[PDB]
Ligand binder design. Sequence first.
Ligand SMILES: Nc1ncnc2c1ncn2[C@@H]1O[C@H](COP(=O)(O)OP(=O)(O)OP(O)(O)=S)[C@@H](O)[C@H]1O
Ligand SMILES: Nc1ncnc2c1ncn2[C@@H]1O[C@H](COP(=O)(O)OP(=O)(O)OP(O)(O)=S)[C@@H](O)[C@H]1O
Ligand SMILES: [Mg+2]
Ligand SMILES: [Mg+2]
Lengths: 256, 257, 318, 330, 183
Amino acid sequence: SMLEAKFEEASLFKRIIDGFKDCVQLVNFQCKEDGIIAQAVDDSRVLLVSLEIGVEAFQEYRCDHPVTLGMDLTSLSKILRCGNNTDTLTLIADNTPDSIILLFEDTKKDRIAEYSLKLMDIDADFLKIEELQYDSTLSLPSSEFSKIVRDLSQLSDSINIMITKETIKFVADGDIGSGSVIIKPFVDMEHPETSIKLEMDQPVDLTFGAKYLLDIIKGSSLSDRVGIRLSSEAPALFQFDLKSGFLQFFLAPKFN
Amino acid sequence: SMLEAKFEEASLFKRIIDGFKDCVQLVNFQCKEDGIIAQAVDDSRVLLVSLEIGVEAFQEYRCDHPVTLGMDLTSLSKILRCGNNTDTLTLIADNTPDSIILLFEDTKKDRIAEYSLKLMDIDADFLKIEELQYDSTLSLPSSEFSKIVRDLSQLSDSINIMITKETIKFVADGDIGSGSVIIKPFVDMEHPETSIKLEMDQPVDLTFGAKYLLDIIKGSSLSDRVGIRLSSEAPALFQFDLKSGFLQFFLAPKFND
Amino acid sequence: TLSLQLPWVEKYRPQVLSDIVGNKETIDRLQQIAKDGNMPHMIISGMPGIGKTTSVHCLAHELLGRSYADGVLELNASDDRGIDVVRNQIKHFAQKKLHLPPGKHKIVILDEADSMTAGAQQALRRTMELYSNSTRFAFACNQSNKIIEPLQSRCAILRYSKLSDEDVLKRLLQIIKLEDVKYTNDGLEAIIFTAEGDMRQAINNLQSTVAGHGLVNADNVFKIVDSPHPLIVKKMLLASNLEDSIQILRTDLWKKGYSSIDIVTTSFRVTKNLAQVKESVRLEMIKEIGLTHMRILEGVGTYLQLASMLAKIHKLNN
Amino acid sequence: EKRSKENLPWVEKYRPETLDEVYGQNEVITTVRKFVDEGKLPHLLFYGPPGTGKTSTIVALAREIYGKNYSNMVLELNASDDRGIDVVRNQIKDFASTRQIFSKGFKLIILDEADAMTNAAQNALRRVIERYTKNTRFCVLANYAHKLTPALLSRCTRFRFQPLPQEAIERRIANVLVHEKLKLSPNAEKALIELSNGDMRRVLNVLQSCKATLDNPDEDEISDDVIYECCGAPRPSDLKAVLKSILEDDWGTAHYTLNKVRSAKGLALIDLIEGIVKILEDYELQNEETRVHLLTKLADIEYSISKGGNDQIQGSAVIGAIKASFENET
Amino acid sequence: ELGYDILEQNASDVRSKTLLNAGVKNALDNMSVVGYFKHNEEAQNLNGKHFVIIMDEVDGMSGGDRGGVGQLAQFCRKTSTPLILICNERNLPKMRPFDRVCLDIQFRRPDANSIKSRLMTIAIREKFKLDPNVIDRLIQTTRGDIRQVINLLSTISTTTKTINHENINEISKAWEKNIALKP
DNA sequence: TTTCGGGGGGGCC
DNA sequence: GGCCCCCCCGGC
Ligand SMILES: Nc1ncnc2c1ncn2[C@@H]1O[C@H](COP(=O)(O)OP(=O)(O)OP(O)(O)=S)[C@@H](O)[C@H]1O
Ligand SMILES: Nc1ncnc2c1ncn2[C@@H]1O[C@H](COP(=O)(O)OP(=O)(O)OP(O)(O)=S)[C@@H](O)[C@H]1O
Ligand SMILES: [Mg+2]
Ligand SMILES: [Mg+2]
């Protein structure tokens, strides 16, 4: 077995999968000697998911040469649900793989469960996510953002984020009135987690649909602070930092 | 009356009937002086159900001569739903009866509900298919078996069970992929209710339909443990023991080809 | 007594394309495709007992070798093949990743594709196109008209012809040689005569003989086998006199146990395809036969009604 | 059932139990017995008219193969049970793809009256039959072969059940008489066979009715008269007299004779028409148009009678049609 | 050719009102992340950032797609991006909702003089002889179907290396397209 | 257009 | 998972 990844517990893998399972259907992993990366484009070709897990998230990791594995989220989630939460999950793949093996091992009951998942053929090349000079780099706690988007989605089907001098406006003009929320740079010492920081360079005003933002916030439980990078005209970058790695959502804006 | 059998709580009989109502259509009870033994065969002639409620499960049980009662489980369940879950249930029958009387009595009040279900002329024998010497006999908690069956049935419509020396393997091979679960015998003196026992004579490898196992696992609500007995050239036995009787599912394996 | 013997239809089902008799051109094309590869989307059409399923299975087996169990998805009328099945299971199979020799592809066999609904056939359209570099489709049907035009456009048409007497005789002689079955020429001629180009029926009757009486001769075959009643109906409807037609109807059909509805339906079908009689006469005969058929359907099915139909037919043909 | 077999109708009381109790189908019985005695059992099809012994034969064969417990080792379906596409795809497939529960052996599926099944179910049955042939055998029973699809017929070995012969009917009648302690006159047996039309059910029903008719069956003998009164059928003498009067008397005499003959025993006109047709089909008519007119007009009258109408007008039409048709003889 | 990014939905997708109003709808007025991340280094390629919706096989929308036709008709009049619908037969009652909400473009059967050079090129590359005089006949065999005629050439060339007048009759008779006639 | 019956495919629950 | 409803064929 050329790829022999071994998570400490199956909780981590299932949590990352659930972080972005509801927005995509097919995913493609490159596993190398440095870790695992994944890029997925939604059926609507609007939302891009970019996940990477470093070698520090695995108790053991070995990969002779790079491996590309195409999989479907539904089947992977179904196979993962079978194994218990408190087991050791090993991802095994051989040379020129046609399927990926998931081994759930419980050392207490001494139980081994092997599930082989057939890989899909995905030809779409990964889009080069080259570093962008984002005009605005907002960062806010996960709970605040989750609550704000959930509340605003009920009023309107899309929300406009405006970043200006010490001002963050989540306008939600729509069918139900024009209820909006406003925040300003805030800092706390007792709990630095609740530290809203703004690093604007040029004023930003970008509107995004409610469905994609709802899907993104669905993964808020996977982190504590969300980093929202916005530009004058470019996809917005929503970053959740993991214990070892990250999960990004690139969401394209709407016309005008 | 010829036959009078009282259940202290109607929930007992409702639960027993609920354990095998989703796999058979017509049931045949045959009451004796040593309890009530019932059989039911499914429409596909692939699964058989045998229940042997004993006399110790009734407050009082009186039966003069053996009496046969052919019934439809749908109507029986329909009427049993009528009665409350806090009333005593008397099963009453007469000599060569034309109907079976279910009498729900609530001691709290003076309300008595009598339901007469017309019987069917079901003439069949049991044949006592309990092949003497099996090839393997395992016993394990019903919860683990139910979990394994539910997990594997989602992969394929067929499940293969292999019994080897100190090894029990459940395998499913579907379209999206395959899944294998291996369990070895172990014992815990602290909590023997969770132990797994295996007695082996010759290796076994038998395939079964997932639908029938999904139907069978519904009996786990009656017993905390399940005993599976397997033997080549014979149907597989799935036994759930009860307070005084048991419920047995005889499932025919699929042809290998 | 409780052990069954494998029927000759399954015991000698061709396992290689070289053992399929008839349709020499198409079989040669399939053999060359197997030799080279690059199997295209194809639709094999024909009539019962000619070797369509055998041809498709042999082609798939010889093409995919050891990878038959992983690169072949077979579905028939005994399996659910609705819109959901096409949109999920077949799509997943086509999108599956599998390593195969240079010029080999996964095969999706849809036996009896005629029964498939229009929705499933429409859904298959873009699936056969987006994944044509890894998966190919082989439909087998009896009536090609039941397959929608867009699907026919994407596949190669392979219309099979009925096996001639020579090919049936060749395969039958091979089977006899393998099973060492005593036979006579007249028995084989009778078997072919009853077969009507159906190899399955020929083999079944050959087994019934030998199994029933032993030596294969016309006598035993006709003792167990009956001459096709359509020929009897044709002879009845072509008799020069009403007396002869009534005699045939009584002796050969009514006293043999054939139902009136069967007789009238066969008469209709035979009259439809009597190329030796003028079209107008056939149309008048069909009108009379339809009147009699309606009377029989109403419930009045008797020998007298069929006799009256024959009398009216002879009235017209005079 | 209830009580002993003596409470059952004769049609069911005398149902063949073994394969040696089936009469009139010697060839088919011998062939199936040889097939079962050597393990060479193919997919069988039994095509035949009503009351010939197809169900009895298949049940007897199943009993021979399995034994007294055949009901627990076969899948029998008929027109009373739903046999849709779902049934074929689930129940039949499960039965064919699974081992026997009770005792080892192959699986037998008896689709009685398969001509009532829809085209979709028959089409779905094709690969089901062809794929599990190693461990399962299919038997089909039919009265109308036009309802069965060509493919299903191609997959089955056909056996034709002929109308029951005269000798077989006499042997069965002899057995029934011996068991029932009855006496039957030779002419009574002749009439019974003639009216049976090759159906044993009719024979048994008419014989039971005749036994009921007799006041003291213990020593009374069944005569042709008993059959005629029981069934209400015209006597041959009555038909001959009616035909004679129609053919060589004037309209008034023919009308009077027909009315008197019918009112003597309340005979029905349809039975008279059938009897006269049978008598005339043996005549040697010089001219073909005579036979043509007879057949056409009598068929029209029979069809009209089938839907009610006026009885007197129908009888007069019969008389006039016969007279006009025979006028062509010259 | 115009630089637009293609979003496609075929009959293999369930195009019902419930999922149509929750899927492609959002893309009617949204940019393409693929376009931005793929054309970031390009210049003057504005269309790269836009969407072009292609609904293929609209006539194939069976009962599995409830209310899809009406939703497509509504989108046709309220779409912010170019939308192209493809169907085989336009004169069905079921296609009435698109009566006067789209620009209708008819594609007629190509003539035998339009694909002639293509057939010579295919013959030259595939190393088999195709006499031009029998090309026309083939077009009538498939009723002006280019895919069908190419498939016919591929299948016949497998064993027959010459398509001439001595065998064209057999191929034409064995590959005849049986199209059901109309009222 | 159109008088039952069977099958499919979606919508409440 | 199960009713409940609507739509569509039906010969060879
Ligand atoms: N060309 C053939 N050569 C030898 N045997 C044949 C041939 N065709 C049919 N048979 C025999 O008949 C049996 C059945 O053949 P099939 O391939 O099932 O016919 P089929 O045309 O596919 O049936 P349909 O169209 O679904 S009714 C085979 O197993 C063979 O034993
Ligand atoms: N060959 C026979 N020998 C003796 N009795 C017969 C025979 N055939 C029919 N019968 C009698 O008639 C009764 C009915 O016979 P069946 O087996 O039901 O005929 P069947 O041909 O299967 O009826 P159909 O075709 O479904 S209307 C039997 O109980 C027998 O008593
Ligand atoms: Mg076939
Ligand atoms: Mg019968």
